[PDB]
């Protein structure tokens, strides 16, 4: 019943706070909306460095509102040359059931919340994803992410369509790291990812031996 | 820019009239619709609010009160989770099932009420 306006949230460290729009799409019943933050290990945290307000609020049917994400002074303890990962949670609370013998199911939504320090703020027309490197190895590719940002890879194929249609286990690369995935060998690799806005671009690679980079 | 949109209807699995004699092993389901405008992937996880009166091994369960439990399933799985994939834009359905009692049913019937959380983790 209670929906969110995006699939991930990027918190520009240069700002003090930001907001997310939520909506009670149910037209007959009022719902309560709980919001909270979890750290990188999905452990709920209530004392920072990032918080959500209000923790709970009421939404009349069809009502629109929002949740504010703010930082505390401890936000400075985080590394400033790379992103830190948090999770935003939104759980609804339907009104008690009016009928007898009922199992109520409440929806909850969890999305990745990327804290991006001002030191690594990007230019809205910048694509750090094309810095990724694919090294052919036994059984697949060793994917390198030399950037300070997390990268969510959703596709990897021999063609554009294969990269976006092909069955692939999604993996998210932490900043400045590498990960190895199993997959067939492709003469011209194509990789798909999800960017800041939910866009799903596809990257075409050119290989120099076992080393492949963006064309 | 926003993602898939689940139907807004309230999710209530209704078992209706139930007799203290023939109440256990009952079954009732609910269907949640999800519309995505782009190919997508969603992981669904059940979480328990009401604590289970009995033990059910690996199966997920919640408490319905008065000595009664319920084994909740998603898309036919009793494990506690499942993932749905959209190979293209469109609407896909997630079914929630609810089977009653289990173990040592030394109940004390009288209007059952319970609840669980259906979590959606988005990549």
UniProtKB/Swiss-Prot annotation, chain A:
Keywords: Chaperone, Disulfide bond, Fimbrium biogenesis, Immunoglobulin domain, Periplasm, Signal. It is found in: Periplasm. The keyword Zinc does not apply. Disulfide bonds join 207-212. GO terms for biological process: cell wall organization; chaperone-mediated protein folding. GO terms for cellular component: outer membrane-bounded periplasmic space. PROSITE patterns: PILI_CHAPERONE. Pfam families: PapD_C, PapD_N. The keyword Oxidoreductase does not apply. Binds and caps interactive surfaces on P pilus subunits to prevent them from participating in non-productive interactions. Facilitates the import of P pilus subunits into the periplasm, probably also facilitates their folding. Chaperone-subunit complexes are then targeted to the PapC outer membrane usher where the chaperone must uncap from the subunits. Coexpression of this chaperone with individual, otherwise toxic, P pilus subunits (tested with PapA, PapE and PapG) suppresses their growth inhibitory phenotype. Interacts with substrates PapG and PapK. PapD donates its G1 beta strand to complete the Ig fold of PapK (donor strand complementation). Belongs to the periplasmic pilus chaperone family. This is Chaperone protein PapD.
């Amino acid at each position: 019943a209670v929906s969110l306006d995006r699939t991930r949230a990027v918190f520009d460290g240069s700002e003090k706070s930001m907001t997310l729009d939520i909506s009670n799409d149910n037209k007959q019943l009022p719902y309560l909306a709980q919001a909270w933050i979890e750290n990188e290990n999905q452990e709920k945290i209530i004392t920072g460095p990032v918080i959500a307000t209000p923790p709970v609020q009421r939404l009349e049917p069809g009502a629109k509102s929002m949740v504010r994400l703010s930082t505390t002074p401890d936000i400075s303890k985080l590394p400033q040359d790379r992103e830190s990962l948090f999770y935003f949670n939104l759980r609804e609370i339907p009104p008690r059931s009016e009928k007898a013998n009922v199992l109520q199911i409440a929806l909850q939504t969890k999305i990745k919340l990327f804290y991006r320090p001002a030191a690594i703020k990007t230019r809205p027309n910048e694509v750090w994803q094309d810095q990724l490197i694919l090294n052919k190895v036994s059984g697949g590719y060793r994917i390198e992410n030399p950037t300070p940002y997390y990268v969510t890879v959703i596709g990897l194929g021999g063609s554009e369509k294969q990269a976006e249609e092909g069955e692939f286990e999604t993996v998210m690369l932490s900043p400045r790291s590498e990960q190895t995935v199993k997959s067939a060998n492709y003469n011209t690799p194509y990789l798909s990812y999800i960017n800041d806005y939910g866009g799903r671009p596809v990257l075409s690679f050119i290989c120099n031996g076992s080393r492949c980079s963006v064309k | 820019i926003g993602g898939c949109r689940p139907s807004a209807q309230s999710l209530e699995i209704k078992h209706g009239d139930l007799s203290i004699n023939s109440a256990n092993n009952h079954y009732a389901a609910q269907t949640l619709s999800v519309s995505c405008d782009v190919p997508a992937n969603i992981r669904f996880m059940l979480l328990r609010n009401t604590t289970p009166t009995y033990s059910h091994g690996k199966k997920f369960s919640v408490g319905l009160g008065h000595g009664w439990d319920s084994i909740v399933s998603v898309n036919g799985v009793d494990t506690g989770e499942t993932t749905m994939r959209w190979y293209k834009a469109g609407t896909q359905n997630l079914t929630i099932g609810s089977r009653l009692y289990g173990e040592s049913s030394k109940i004390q019937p009288g209007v059952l009420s319970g609840s669980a959380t259906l979590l959606m983790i988005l990549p």
